[PDB]
Design a binder for this molecule. Structure first.
Ligand SMILES: CCCCCCCCCCCCCCCC(=O)OP(=O)(O)OC[C@H]1O[C@@H](n2cnc3c(N)ncnc32)[C@H](O)[C@@H]1O
Ligand SMILES: [Mg+2]
Length: 567
């Protein structure tokens, strides 16, 4: 299984050894099973979608995948890998909504094809002719006869061949196209396994969106790499009823499931004690947390709320990675059983220094140990010099899981993927600030979002966290801290969402004073402005990640749903 150069060779091996073993079982409601596929059935569907793609002239071309969460997406993705089509996964179009995001990906990828369901094709095909022209082909893959796979021409695949374009969320700018090779998929899959240590006997459940990151290389490809059964449900099922995630873990004895930090909080806040009494989570040995700052308070609250249900905090597996690194770089608590946490000086962090406080203290959770034969270095963003111990700098990654570059973006590719430091070359600039401590990599935040006000460095998420809890009328997770230029000097602007219940009876001055008071105590900062926005109006990615730069653009252009303003 570890001699496989690509996932096409690998699934074909699994379709022989475990043909009748169930690979994916989809619960459309997060409760009852709706559909399933065996390794043999997944292989056959893949050869058939492949043959449909090759006859449709898609080989060597880029194809958008537009599918609802389900097994059709999975089959279309593996069909593209079998066919030699560069797949471009994306969130599907939704009703009463624009296709701007989708057209922008089509223009960037120079895609000639959209792969979708019969239902969506009948609703979007003419809109795609309007936007992309007649030479663009919206194809449906859900009604391909399985006998078509007899006409599949196996491409001569090498690991250096490009498999798919993984587009970034667009939190810091425009989505960029990550060129993920076949070797990138195989190398990182092994890296996830050197850390997760899963076996053919491991069970998995995943509500994560299948389009990108943890949902695709981990929720779809890792089950196939390890030869295990994965239970899958739509993210909306978990979001509406978080108990469905933990009930599935209990029901199928799931060993390995995980999600971003916010999901652990929602499970803790929205699961009743009667529901906790229906749970047995002793089966959960790896509970991963990635794609978002891991907060120490969230780890403790989950461990405390669910210890009666058998959850152990030793199961928490902190992990870090990005699309430019395929998926994972660091993970695990090392020789420790519990996620390593350091208590350091707040003002020190604002000064790129990690030191004890002698000064308010901050608690930082490690994002894991560098997994495998990859090399992580902490470098100064401007001087391109390697930071010493206790210094905070840009995380730099050199390894075989580093993507080939950004699609049709040559200048940015040389800048971010040709990182030179001292006598070293070939490093990827992650754009993430952090530091090395205890063999563990800690992450402080994103460079492009870092706020520099009054000669001090301020992390936007640290300020957003203070504002959300300042008044009950503020919606948590729906706020942005941005720097605007006032007379040549940088100042702080807060764009925060008000709660739907508090929108009509909102005391702008009272809540603004609660906000100014909290930011001054914790950050010694005075907001130039506080813009209160309507519930659900914050510029967000398709994932839900806040676009802070677009909040500053909208404040400066007046495009926000303003229900209140302070200046
Ligand atoms: C059968 C068993 C199943 C197997 C499952 C395996 C799956 C587990 C591996 C997930 C490893 C995590 C990667 C996430 C990718 C992504 O997140 O994709 P991407 O959209 O490119 O965002 C990138 C930016 O997210 C921010 N970020 C990511 N990790 C952060 C952190 N630990 N702490 C703070 N910030 C963080 C950061 O800023 C980063 O650069
Ligand atoms: Mg990024």
């Amino acid at each position: 299984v570890g001699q496989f150069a690509n996932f096409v060779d690998l699934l074909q091996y699994r379709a022989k050894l475990q043909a009748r073993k169930t690979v994916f079982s989809f619960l459309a409601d997060g409760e009852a099973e709706s559909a399933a596929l065996t390794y043999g059935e997944l292989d056959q569907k893949a050869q058939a979608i492949a043959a449909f793609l090759q006859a449709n002239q898609a080989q060597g071309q880029r194809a958008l995948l537009l599918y609802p969460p389900g097994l059709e997406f999975i089959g279309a993705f593996l069909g593209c890998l079998y066919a030699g089509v560069v797949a471009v996964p994306a969130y599907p179009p939704r009703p009463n909504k624009s296709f701007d995001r989708l057209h922008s990906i089509i223009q960037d990828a120079q895609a000639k094809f959209a792969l979708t369901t019969t239902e969506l094709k009948d609703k979007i095909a003419d809109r795609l002719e309007a936007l992309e022209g007649t030479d663009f082909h919206c194809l449906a893959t859900d009604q391909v006869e399985l006998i078509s796979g007899k006409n599949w021409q196996k491409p001569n695949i090498s690991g250096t061949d490009l498999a798919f374009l993984q587009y970034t969320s667009g939190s810091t700018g425009d989505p960029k196209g990550v060129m993920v090779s076949h070797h990138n998929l195989i190398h990182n899959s092994g890296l996830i396994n050197q850390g997760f240590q899963d076996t053919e006997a491991s069970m998995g459940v995943s509500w994560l969106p299948p389009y990108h990151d943890m949902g695709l290389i981990g929720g779809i490809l890792q089950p196939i790499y390890v030869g295990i059964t994965q239970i899958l449900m739509p993210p909306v099922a978990f979001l509406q009823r978080p108990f469905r995630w933990l009930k599935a873990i209990n029901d199928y004895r799931v060993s390995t499931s995980g999600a971003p930090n916010f999901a652990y909080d929602l499970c803790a806040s929205q699961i009743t004690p009667e529901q906790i009494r229906e749970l047995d989570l002793s089966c959960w040995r790896l509970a991963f947390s990635g794609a978002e700052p891991i907060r120490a308070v969230t780890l403790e609250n989950f461990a405390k709320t669910f210890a009666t249900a058998g959850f152990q905090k030793s199961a928490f597996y902190p992990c870090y990675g990005m699309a430019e690194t395929t998926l994972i770089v660091s993970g695990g608590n090392g020789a420790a059983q519990l996620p390593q946490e350091i208590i350091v000086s707040k003002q020190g962090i604002e000064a790129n220094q990690v030191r004890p406080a002698q000064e308010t203290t901050v608690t930082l959770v490690g994002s894991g140990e560098v997994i495998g034969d990859q090399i992580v270095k902490i470098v100064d963003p401007q001087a391109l010099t390697e930071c010493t111990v206790g210094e905070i700098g840009e995380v730099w990654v050199k390894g075989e899981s580093v993507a080939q570059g950004y699609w049709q973006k040559p200048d940015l590719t040389q800048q971010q993927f040709q990182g030179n430091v001292g006598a070293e070359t070939g490093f990827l600039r992650t754009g993430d600030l952090g530091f090395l401590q205890g063999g563990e990599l800690y992450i402080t935040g994103r460079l492009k979002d870092l706020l520099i006000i009054r000669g001090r460095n301020h992390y936007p998420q640290d300020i957003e966290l203070t504002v959300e809890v300042a008044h009950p009328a503020l919606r948590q997770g729906a706020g942005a801290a941005v720097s605007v230029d006032v007379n040549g000097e940088e100042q702080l602007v807060i764009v925060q969402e008000v709660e739907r219940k508090y929108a009509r009876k909102l005391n702008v001055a009272a809540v603004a004073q609660a906000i100014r008071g909290a930011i001054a105590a914790e950050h010694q900062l005075q907001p130039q402005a506080i813009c209160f926005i309507k519930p659900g109006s914050i510029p967000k990615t398709s994932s839900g990640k806040i676009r802070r730069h677009a909040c500053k653009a909208g404040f400066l252009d007046g495009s926000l749903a303003v229900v209140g303003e302070w200046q």
